[model samples]
Target chain A: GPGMGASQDDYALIHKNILHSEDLLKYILETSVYPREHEQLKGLREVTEKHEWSMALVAADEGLFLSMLLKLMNAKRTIEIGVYTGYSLLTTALALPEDGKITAIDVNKSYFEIGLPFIQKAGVEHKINFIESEALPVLDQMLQEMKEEDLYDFAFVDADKPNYANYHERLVKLVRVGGAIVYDNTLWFGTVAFPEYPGLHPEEEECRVSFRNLNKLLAADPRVEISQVSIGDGLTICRRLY
Target chain B: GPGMGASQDDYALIHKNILHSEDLLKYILETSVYPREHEQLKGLREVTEKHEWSMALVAADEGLFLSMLLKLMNAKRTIEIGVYTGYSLLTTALALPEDGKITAIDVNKSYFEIGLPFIQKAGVEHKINFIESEALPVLDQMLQEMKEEDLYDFAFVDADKPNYANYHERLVKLVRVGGAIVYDNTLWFGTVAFPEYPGLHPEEEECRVSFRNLNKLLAADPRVEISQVSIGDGLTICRRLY
Candidate 1:
């Protein structure tokens, strides 16, 4: 979901933009939203800016939104299926209480290391159980150990697209009834809704289709109540009910 | 917030539109979201459509989203600051349990009576405590009786734009910590972010400015966790924190 580069058109759908202007986006961040980063978050953001896939970094608004959500849920046990330089990871870590824990999974450790020092500097390094492996195994393991209705208070999915539906199936069982599972890039640069926009990358076609398919599936899924909110690149929040 | 007609450029800002096509918006609604309305909702929608301010009706996407949110929270104690023809009120009522209660407020009862029959037919009229009066006085009375941190589990504000911040200030105290307060039309027809845009209605400038001010205020407020999600003309969600 993070491989493509952004063009001027991509900025048009950056959540609340009325007109396609970069300056207005920046101004909105400045004037409309509060400053959210502390020293460690700022450092993590700074280091990630130097990475090649820094474009995948969570936008300022989305990062703040996640932190806010975590606090609202009083989220204790959580999981992150993606760690693109841990921008969202750090955001989540900051929102949790001292005893809170996160099971963070990523296929590659190198991208996560890019933000590790900052996470340590932020004093939330102990909170994350970084797993350098595929996401399915961990989720399956959680399903095996599942006992109660509310095993985890929250879960964030920003990993491989084709696995999104698979993740939702397991996540519904893993997360408690009334708990939240947020899938990022549900909009897929808005390509999932508009395939012929001429800007979608050729290679990401599979991802786009997978995302679109998952969107329709979740809309009708009875196990969870959902809102496909248009945030940073779209975030679909599915709250498990059964 | 919903009475204004959208132009070509306006459709461009719709959350589900692609290439600014009405067909795409319709397709997205049909294919990507569940068919939310039943006969009662359909009847009310038909009646509301004939009204002069039909455009002010809550959009289908938003109605479903709020219903989803209410279920996710297992919301029992709730409040609705606006009840134009009861579109959203019905949505909330359908999602709630048998004993779930809603304090629905609106300035005009004639408008509310338009949809009351449908609500009665839906068999959820018992859930609502309809108050036909100004919102502020009712909110003020609640503030006086407030004895708990989380008095109400959820609240929806979609009445007058000028009183949004004022409503928020009271609602924050009235809603329990970890409860949600959703402010509709936060984008003010997308004009709040683009005052200079030529298409902005000159008469609604005051409403837009008030909305803009409230947006900034909510963004900075420390008492609530916030997400400026683009749902229906943008919905700013603030989950109260102690």
Candidate 2:
């Protein structure tokens, strides 16, 4: 009657609390799985939660998975666009080889300055080359100036939506052979399939259009293989062969 | 109408051979993203596909995630309860620090022997201690020899299912505070949820029971924090704390 095994009666005894550990101590410590913390990251997480801000970040579960993907690849060169508050940046930097480098590009420094202390506290500051600019310009410069063999080993794209196609065009050249790229927020809260509610801002509208188009585009991209796992709005991992 | 933005032309396009070249390349290369290549390892994948044996191994994605998690944790010590073909063993070994050690136990030497060349080719063979025997007896020995203070930073549980409860009991003592134990195949191809297919044997029943009881026990275990993600059947991650 319900969704396969889920039923109204099944809901009665479901351990709602067990969905996540409710223990206050474990919640405080385990929730922040990383050993170090920054005051700004803590604040940004709160701000994003309350403001319905841009979903340009990977959740802890995705963070765990991304860290593993980097390690398995022995990825030494990485890139990240949309460096808001640097949560995913920290996760990426923390997972890289000591000599690894991440060319992190973002439009705003003030937003990321908040998490700078936390990133420094983790001692991965050196791995990051934080550029203060929108992603496209920096990516274009990187692609044209760099040699064909100078491709990134890994990348995470989570910036403006309309620019995603543009990002992929350049990233296709930026990512090395046998490298990977992940685009976060592909599902847009399942709204990609159905658009409801009025007064959606044009940028939001653009994002919806861009994401839906990119989803269709990516499903057919020949140079990269794709898997869209529905976790935290949906994360798509693309592995490059060229 | 359809849900929200239903389009009249949505169902008109029934396409074939739609995957693009980059996408095909990505699918081919994503499974082997590492810059380091081993012919033997590639051969193992071919063999696994051919055999379709019960003791195949971890999902491509799960292995990728585990490798990244270990590197993120800077994990040095690890334990594995099952050694089907040792693909996972190779994944972890390659991800760990040079001096990192993994104690791998399994019953089938012949199968593992087939994978040994690939494992050795990774050049972290020294980091692994392979024990050829059924897991439980060695696990008990580990419990007796391994102290609660002797922290195993990470552990993978993938042995015979009837002995799962036994494995958990021993691993709890071996894993340190703040460390984790991952239980693989918690979903068992969605079988545990369905009672219609009575397990072919007691071991099968135990496998189902393993999930049933562990789900219940883990829900209440005060000493650890946990979450289950639907990756590669399912993987339940438990972090120990005291």
Candidate 3:
């Protein structure tokens, strides 16, 4: 049976309203994404469904897209800046080579532990180095001790939207040239397109405004070439150019 | 001066209703796509806007996404199965290295020729070997003459939707393992989700149903790992597994 408040199985709520209609999103989820989803991934989704913030999980299709990109780049060492329920973190862990390594940081480790069992079941735990800390401090400390060898092949950020620009300023230097840094929810659930509207939480509006600004910042950043893809809220993919 | 039937700058018509709001799509286009779009790409869009089938041209954001994927793969030799005004083709040519080569084919030579001037001005014509013929015949003949050196690093198809599965059968072989084949409009403008509606053009419905089928076909195809992205209508990206 589905959970109260929100069904973990409801595509409409899980996906949000990024696309035109729920039916279209459902068609995509049923036809391609869910059919091929790893059993562990589905397990994580179901487990996280009861969490108050379960809706914050990454979309299934983005995980597929990320896997393809990781393999295409032959990514070895990578980093993840957010780990709510660890869906994307687990995704990165699974997509990488057996010897691959991922440094994942999160302010709330309890949420991640909620999904850690699935990651353990998937047998990709060895690939993940989960750090229980806020991302900015860890990133700053890493930069202080940075080495050319420390340059990551990729970085995925799904942290607080307001601080995304700050992350990019650091991530661009951390990921090597031709490497990628993808920021999740860059579209702020498509609210970036709207006028100042009522019923939005002040926090929600703040993130939306910040993301709207971050879009412009990344586009003009010369340090990377970017594509704002409308998948799962919206993914802003930046390939470091310098 | 824009045009009669459509304003060259009207993104809603050019982009269709893929996202929840025209404002959101336009926001992405203006913030990221248009700012970085090569001059020739914009020129081609302007010229294609006058064509009756102008809406068939690749969306601006898709061009950016394709460019990122091409560069990510370090694609050297690629093939494009359909060319309508060559927005995606030109995007590919521009993204590839100076020595890179692309084999682009379209049933209607006139449409491609319209964009040829822009491609020429972009000064990447040497990279493209365009063929004016039905794709299947060309694909069939090429397969008969296939060799290791003839393998493609990537393939882009934006042609007739019903024939996508047919293209996949041959492209899976032509594009080497680790290579990618991306099909445009696999979402078929989101019509795949709706019940058979009354107002749909028979031709439109046929393409929709075929694309809906193609999504399932690509998903079930073992030879490739797939990600159906919702940028333009929908981009079904297939990375050859074998």
Fnat per candidate, as a fraction, reads 0.33, 0.00, 0.82
* Per-residue lDDT of candidate 2, residues B147-235 (tens digit): 65567989998877657667888787888876878888765544455444442444455566667566556646777656555455566
Ranking by DockQ: 3, 1, 2
| iRMSD in angstroms, per model | 3.9, 11.6, 0.9
Best by lDDT: 3
lDDT string for model 3 (A171-236, tens) is 988998899999999888788886664455556768778987888888888989999899988998
Assess the local accuracy of residue B167 in candidate 2 as a C-alpha lDDT between 0 and 100: 82
Better-scoring candidate (lDDT), 2 or 3: 3
**TM-score, candidate number 2:** 0.54
lDDT of 3 at A224: 92
Kindly report which residue stretches of model 3 are placed more than 4 angstroms away from their true locations once superposed. Answer: A1-16, B1-16
User: TM-score of model 3, chain A?
Assistant: 0.92
Q: All candidates' TM-scores?
A: 0.85, 0.54, 0.93
User: Per-residue lDDT tens digits of candidate 2, residues A84-187?
Assistant: 88788887888788999999998988878866777887888999999999888898788669886667888899887678888999998888766788888775
lDDT of 1 by residue, A82-101 (tens): 99789899989999999999
TM-score for chain A in each prediction: 0.87, 0.78, 0.92
Looking at model 2, give its docking quality level.
incorrect
